[PDB]
């Protein structure tokens, strides 16, 4: 009675929170949890798969979004259950996730209510050949649904790192003449990068830039000012996913919450 979890070698702190939930449910049901890491090297990825097959796992939980199709097919073809978390990896399998459009729309709704019109999405905003640009597309859809235009929509960045947040307002835009009043950060660390870049250049959040992040992990509480954030319930994603395996395709959505803290200015005030 073993289940596997595949975690990217490069991941936000959210993996540990998902794993805490998976672990709670595996322990109480008589299963053990094996954790394995996945790099972007096809040959190493295959070695790993032989390690999932050869520990005769009953299920594999995927957190990545960057999993090769042959891995999912090979696992399913061995009668192993495959369930993806925080993303919809394949038509063929079930997923447990926060609802991406609802998260994004909750932020845009809020920032517009707070008087913002010119808004940036900062973090993982790139277009690629094989991976959906989920947040980029949802941001643009939500902004346009709220009757804002292309001229109000700003994008920056290739990943969820602190560095991307930091560079967005140093190399990306003119920190002394920012064309947006608010930034939606695709992960908490991007938000911290923004805070520090502003502070390091003698500016202050939220007076000089409002920020909202997605994930709502510890860093949003450690930041000064404390970051307004859409908090995901990562442990619940894990628990619900394991329970889905135990009870046996579909998509199950776990709700999120926009937590209002100290990083947004009311421009109507």
Ligand X SMILES: OC[C@H]1O[C@H](O)[C@H](O)[C@@H](O)[C@@H]1O
Residues that bind its own copies (CB under 8 A): 2, 9, 13, 19-20, 23, 27, 32-37, 39, 44, 47-48, 50-51, 55, 162, 189, 192, 196, 199-200, 218, 222, 224
**Whole-number minimum distance, CB 146 to its own copies, in Å?**
33
Q: Say whether residue 160 binds ligand X (CB under 6 A).
A: yes
DSSP structure class, residue 255: P
**Whole-number minimum distance, CB 226 to ligand X, in Å?**
18
Tell me whether residue 75 or residue 87 sits nearer to ligand X (CB atom).
Answer: 87
Tell me whether residue 12 or residue 142 sits nearer to ligand X (CB atom).
Answer: 12
Q: Report the residue from 136, 184, 215, 231 that binds ligand X according to the rule CB under 6 A.
A: 215
**Whole-number minimum distance, CB 254 to its own copies, in Å?**
22
Q: Residue 227: CB partners within 8 Å, gap ≥ 6?
A: 188, 191, 192, 195, 211, 212, 213, 219, 220, 221, 261, 262, 263
Structure tokens that stand for 261 in this block: 């803290």
**Torsion of Cα atoms, 103 then 104 then 106 then 108, to 10°:** 170
- Residues 78-107 close enough to bind ligand X by CB under 6 A: 86-87
Whose tokens are 């394949």? That residue is 90
Q: Say whether residue 187 binds ligand X (CB under 6 A).
A: yes
List residues in the chain that are followed by a break over 2.5 Å (C to N).
Answer: 248
Tell me whether residue 160 or residue 239 sits nearer to ligand X (CB atom).
Answer: 160
Residue 251 interacting entry, from its own copies, ligand X, none, C-beta within 5 to 8 Å by type: none
Residue 14 interacting entry, from its own copies, ligand X, none, C-beta within 5 to 8 Å by type: ligand X
Structure tokens that stand for 117 in this block: 């019109």
Q: Determine how β-strand 228-231 pairs with β-strand 257-259.
A: antiparallel
Q: Say whether residue 17 binds ligand X (CB under 6 A).
A: no
Measured on CA atoms in the order 237, 240, 244, 249, is the torsion positive or negative?
negative
Measuring CA to CA, how many Å separate 250 from each of 81, 220, 254?
13, 32, 13
């Amino acid at each position: 009675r073993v289940v596997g979890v595949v975690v990217p070698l490069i991941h936000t702190n959210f993996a540990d929170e998902i794993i805490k939930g998976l672990y709670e449910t595996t322990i109480s049901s008589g299963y053990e949890l094996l954790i394995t890491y996945l790099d972007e090297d096809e040959d190493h990825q295959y070695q790993v798969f032989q390690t999932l097959l050869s520990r005769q796992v009953g299920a594999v939980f995927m957190l990545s979004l960057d999993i090769p199709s042959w891995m999912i097919d090979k696992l399913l073809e061995e009668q192993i259950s495959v369930i993806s978390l925080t993303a919809l990896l394949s038509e063929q399998i079930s997923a447990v996730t926060s609802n991406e459009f609802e998260m994004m729309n909750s932020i845009v709704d809020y920032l517009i209510d707070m008087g913002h019109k010119n808004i940036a999405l900062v973090g993982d905003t790139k277009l690629t050949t094989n991976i959906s640009s989920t947040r980029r597309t949802n941001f643009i859809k939500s902004m346009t649904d709220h009757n804002l235009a292309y001229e109000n929509i700003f994008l920056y960045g290739n990943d969820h790192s602190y560095e991307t947040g930091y560079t967005s307002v140093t190399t990306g835009y003119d920190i002394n003449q920012l064309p947006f009043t608010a930034a939606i950060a695709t992960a908490d660390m991007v938000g911290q990068g923004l805070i520090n870049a502003m502070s390091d250049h003698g500016k202050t959040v939220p007076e000089d830039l409002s920020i909202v992040t997605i994930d709502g992990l510890q860093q949003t509480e450690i930041a000064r000012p404390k970051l307004t954030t859409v908090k995901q319930d990562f442990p619940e994603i894990g628990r619900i996913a394991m329970q889905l395996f135990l009870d046996s395709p579909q998509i199950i959505y776990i709700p999120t919450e926009l937590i209002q803290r100290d990083s947004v200015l009311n421009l109507n005030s």
